[PDB]
Amino acid sequence: SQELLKDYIKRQIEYYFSVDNLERDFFLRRKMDADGFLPITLIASFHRVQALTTDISLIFAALKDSKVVEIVDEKVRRREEPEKWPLPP
RNA sequence: AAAG
């Protein structure tokens, strides 16, 4: 239910952080810090996430269950080699 | 926002 909506959110954000997307997503990489982290609230603004929910705790909850991304406080990054992706602003 |  809300579990179902969490699964859709999780898979959507897991796409953003997939290698297939990252190879062409220059905006996302320009917003990374040098460690690969992005604000979760920036992801929350992306059209396909905001369509599903504007509930920030639901977005956090969806991502805690992810093996693709890791959360530190308010930021999220790809778990595998995140430092390879950031680009100059 | 050609799934930023």
Method: X-ray
Q: Are A32 and A85 in contact (CB under 8 A)?
A: yes
Q: Kindly provide the b/e burial profile for residues A55-75, where b requires at least 16 CB atoms within 10 angstroms of the residue's own CB.
A: eeebbbebbeebebbbeeeeb
Strand B contacts in A 2-61 (CB under 7 A) = 12, 15-16, 21, 25, 27-28, 45-50
Structural element, H or E, at residue A49: helix A47-52
Task: Give the residue among A36, A23, A45 at the shortest CA–CA distance from A75.
Answer: A36
Q: Which nucleotides of B are covered by protein (CB under 7 A)?
A: 1, 3-4
For chain A, the domains span 1-89
Residue A24, token pair as written in the block: 């062409």
Q: CA-to-CA distance for A13 and A58, rounded, in angstroms?
A: 12
How many Å does it take to go from CA A25 to C1' B3?
A: 10
Kindly provide the resolution of this structure in angstroms, with one decimal.
1.6
Strands of the sheet with A69-72, listed across from one edge: A38-39, A75-78, A69-72
Structural element, H or E, at residue A69: strand A69-72
Q: Are A66 and A9 in contact (CB under 8 A)?
A: no
